[PDB]
Symmetry: D4
Subunit: 242 residues, 8 copies
């Protein structure tokens, strides 16, 4: 169907934890976002509980009207936490140095045994898994082989691009990777680092299922208010596919 | 008698620094705040430059339409910066939580003088303690900013009303000694009024609660609301 | 102190329960209200769980930024729930329509001590009746909430001025006994001012008229308008 | 032709009846909706008059600028009321939950002819069942409204895609028989698009989710957003 | 208590009748006004049914959340219509040439018998009567004598004033008349012709109970929307008494 | 293919004239409309000058940022004014309702020529009648504006779809004869789309419905909404 | 009494003339301002017509719903235009080196005869005259002797103050000058250079009748829109007197 | 592809300089515009610094979140400033009588050597250059020969058209010129003088890459506020390509 928007509210919690009070509350932000264009809410539960906390996840699981995408590292703690939470989606990301690739995505091709079992365990709990990876054919083929139904292409390099040519090259790499990914039966997401000024070229990629976006929305929100920030992003995304 | 609002935009920077991009930019937040009820903009240039950075301070000094309140610790590095930057105000802070002025009379006395010679109006961030207020007066600072943190963090209505009375008495005491008095740390939309109602209060410097409301409603409305509640309290 | 506004979000759940879905969610409404002028949120946990449910109270207790006022009947089940929940306030009501305190002195006395033991400030919902008020003071309650329903349902302006005067005298009487006094049931945008102008009023707990305005204009505006009218009446 | 939106304002009355006051008034909500994207207003006059009352229908019939869709059970009382009222549309529903037309051919046939005789366009509320659809065509109804409740309550995405496909095939079947087809029960802001994209859909009659959104954001915005999402799906 | 605002919605109907359709509907405007600062709604049922119609009055009587002020001429038709409608208030105004004074108000002093009976009949039906009159002591004393509980001072001349001095003179006349009126036990209203720029001096008059305003609000409304137009007027009125 | 909107502000004047003051002023409404989606402003200078007046026309000619469409009857007085005023457009109207051009070929032929010599683009307001359209073509007018009144006033969906088909055919017919075609009289927010969807339509001139929505929501939003619905229809 | 706000829309014409187009049009700005808190509209018809033009004045004179305050230099041309135009107010300002003071105000003391005839001529035309002067006793006595009913004190020096002390000094000077002028029978205005951050101290001065402000309001409008800019300035002024 | 909008904020500085104050500040305008649909911000650093100043450029270069388009005349001073500044784009325009065409565009044909070194020098600095020229084939061939990657066609004559025919003629001229330029390898922009009522026909031209508009947007902003003015212009442009 239409391109979906997942809104990552981690930075609502970073603002909160900066002072130790209860506000602003990620629970409030999730309602605002889900009623302004978000089709899902993403929260990354970190080992260091730097922003989102166990309390946020527990309450969010009961208050979200749409569905949760739990971003987490592939460790025994997170896996168990994920199985008991039962979020609709789970997005596996690199936590430490021996988890990420030279560009930032998960190293799936080099850890097939771990990834295969993670995917299987989460799947058994009824969670749809997405593997956050670089737009790299080796990782994509590996994602498919280990059984993950989704992959989320890391759009950071595209976003960080320091020149037009560098950006177009990265865009083309993402587009070609998404096409290759779909040919393997994978569903493909993206979103990390996307902004109001570079999101359309990514949203225009036909194979994209959902763009998971956080920072730029929250950064617009402090000026503009979360409702308009989410709605503007969703509007740009639909225009792009138009 | 005309209560002023100083908006601390440090947390705009915190949000930015969390990812290393240029947005959101403190410079934008300052224009919004100044046109929504802020009478001044406050930034705390920390040693680790974790949120506000030297770039921020340099650009804001050239873009603020009102005036800057530079929050900083008392060190030679910071004093030097202050002197060079020439902010309208400077709020000496540590780095109960207030600045120990009574325990470092020499250091604070020299700090105030130097900053004062740079044309900067100095305020010492202190606890609502009679000993510290006297020390502030004695050392020569024009302003003190009473730490409202304990008032904000109060757990019960009783502990709250007690910290309130302590601040009110501390303010009247400070004023009887020639000092101008500010407050603001930790104030929220739900506890700001009792503090705004204190006659001696000159300016309330508030940050976090405003930014927290802003991520939901936008900075302009967050600032106008806080300013409206403050004037209601004096009214 | 400023007149407070407690917003009763029960009818948000009424709207939700008419269909068995999870929306609209009282948890969202509480955030909106607390940021639009409410100083407290009221929920009435009815034995039949018509609207607010155990889930609601459980989550609200964790998400409210201000404080909870738990409206409830004086029964073992409810007293147990209240002790466990630890809301900041508890408003005891019947299962004119006010609580019969004067005729159940022992029961109310036990209830108040028990809730007070759990650190809960108790309010007895009663008619503007001096016998009931004296009894409320006698059984140890720190608060009473005067039933404004008769005033609100006044059929003629004569019955209205008459009910208003009754409430105002009752309030003055309650205060002279050391009680703090609330009100609010049935108040609307057109009749709230006369009640808000009564000096002894501490907090007005209003629900229905605000939610009825909200379905048209949105909750934020519905709450801010009620708070604005209340403060206008005081000044 | 453009996909139409009928807004069911029943829950405005639910909110009103929970207290016996005159607000919020369904008559106001109808004006708001009609000017924010609604092409029709739906009210369900239940025998128990739970929400919408005779007064409501009476006044609405005179104040609506668009047209009325009267939801009602197939009983003598209701048929009489409908004939007298002359709404532009009548939606027959049970007292999955769709009308059993295939098993009451004579009754539905009498109902349709009778309402058609009063100049009313009849819609039979039925399940996405080809047997029920064929029967609806056979008894003379010009419209059927497919029950989207099962689709809306889908527990898994599998059950959802399955219910969607069932509705879409049923719709195509209904159109091939000369019937016009509506839908809408249980649709929300997150699941309306897939139904609005079905080519044969004429009008979506939605209630609960819009009113649930309204108590938060106001009715005007709640309606305009639903209409916007519907038109986006079509293009 | 506080100064009240009655909003006259006649001109919503004049816009409607100009074309013969159902919109705009006075019923909608009454809801908007009552929720934006109006404490009452006024409608003038004219003999020629030029704007407000019998249908408007009939529906309004059932939809108003506050109270209706039925403006009408003193004729047998209107009196009977008023008795059966039972609006909370009734404001008697001049219809023809033998009904008004040289400035526009009702001629009460010169028609004591009619006015006395009108007042009595309406009062019997439980309607609070207001006599629309010029700021003229003779008419005011007569209003009191015929038993009317309210008078509405015609503020048209004040509004039409063509010079500052002319306005101040008219203001002072209104102020002195209101004071005289109250000394007779009368409650006093005003409002006709008031605008966003001259309403405050009138609202500042202590004896004023309610200002009934129509045209300027509707005229602002077509630009601005009725809600803001009503709220702005109510805001100015309360500032004046502040 | 790019549908234009002409906003008739006559009814702003009607409201003003009802009381003899200067407000509301058509001049203000024209700026609002032109910046909210109007591509042109229309005013009908009637003989009795009941709403728009000579002052209005004289000032608007100097303040409009887009262009004026002068609606007027075919008389020497009006032609003279038009010639002097030099409006960009002129819409000849009577004073089924359309202009009888076929019955006054001589008069209309001379009218168009004179106005055309003054540099004015002429449109003849006519019924969707083949005889009148041919006459319009024959007499030399560049534009015709099809009277949509009967379409608007239709009582049933059948009478409506019939008037619609008549207008659509009339438009294609007019275009096949070299004429540019407009419409607009009586269009509302609920029936405008079917007319906007007609390919041949150049500009829709609409007045009353817009002003009627405006008294509720404000002119800016009323105009932007109508323009949005029109572009949606072509889209 | 009621502190008034006059909004100077000159800079709207400034923006326009920068291109020779017809927009933005001062006539529109005037309607927006008058409905958002302006009690009067001010325009300075310069000899060189740098911004406001004769058409502007001619049309404005017909569309203003409140009243016009025509700022102009004292010359036979302008005097004739003023007498022709008949604006409610006329504020005489300096435009040439031999008309201005070393502070920026009109030099009335140095041109007693010229000002005397100006005030008399304009007064016979029914125009209320104000002399834009510095907060200087010599000029004030001069303004009083020549017969002008109003003076508008130049708040520019107060506005441009660089230190809190310099500012406190100028305010004091203005407050004493206002009292001094009132003791001579003059009514007093101010306004030039006032901003959203320094308007309150001036508005608080009791003798102030009207603050004529332009620049800061337009500067705010370019960002927030004219309506809110005017409404906000008006709100601040009433709060000060509150 | 995606039609871009560059907003020229020069007139914000225009308003400011009219008084020597610091407001309104172009730096604020740029943040508002970039978050409301502007894809770039344009500033014309004039030799005389009539509006935009060196500080403006210096600060803007550090606060812009999108990119700068520096309009400037061709002189050693400006070239050095540009090379120093390193804006993403540079649009060379005429400023003196011997630099302009009888239409208003830059005279590239008549100064091939100068333009040739400008383009080369600016290009080594990594700046993309655009030559602001008339819709004239001689200038276009010249722009192509000298090596500029972009040309910006002067839409002023189209904007100032007085008759629908005159306008139709200019549009045609621009559309053919755009196609002609693209056939020579140039990318093409336009924008000068475009308004909310004539922007669509230009936006519809396929070869258009970016429309740089300023004046009409600021003129609308003074009334409605900058955010809506920018958003609305962007909306109209996308509708045209729709």
């Amino acid at each position: 169907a239409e391109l979906l928007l997942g809104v990552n509210i981690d930075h609502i919690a970073t603002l909160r934890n900066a002072r130790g009070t209860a506000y602003p509350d990620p629970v409030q932000a999730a309602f605002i976002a889900e009623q302004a264009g978000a089709d899902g809410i993403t929260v990354h539960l970190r080992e260091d509980r730097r922003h989102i906390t166990d309390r946020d996840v527990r309450i969010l699981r009961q208050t979200l009207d749409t569905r949760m995408n739990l971003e987490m590292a592939v460790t025994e703690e997170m896996l168990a936490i994920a199985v008991e939470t039962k979020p609709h989606f789970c997005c596996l990301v690199p936590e430490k140095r021996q988890e990420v690739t030279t560009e930032g995505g998960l190293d799936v091709a080099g850890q097939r045994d771990k990834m295969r079992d993670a995917c299987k365990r989460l799947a058994d709990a009824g969670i749809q898994v997405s593997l956050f990876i670089d737009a790299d054919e080796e990782q994509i083929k590996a994602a498919a082989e280990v059984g993950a139904p989704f992959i989320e292409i890391h759009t950071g390099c595209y976003a960080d691009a320091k020149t037009d040519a560098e950006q177009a090259q990265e865009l083309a790499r993402i587009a070609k990777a998404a096409t290759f990914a779909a040919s393997l039966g994978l569903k493909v997401n993206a979103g990390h680092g996307l902004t109001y000024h570079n999101v359309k070229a990514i949203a225009a990629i036909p194979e994209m299922h959902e763009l998971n976006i956080g920072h730029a929305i929250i950064g617009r929100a402090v000026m503009t208010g979360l409702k308009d920030a989410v709605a503007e992003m969703k509007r740009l995304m639909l225009e792009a596919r138009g």
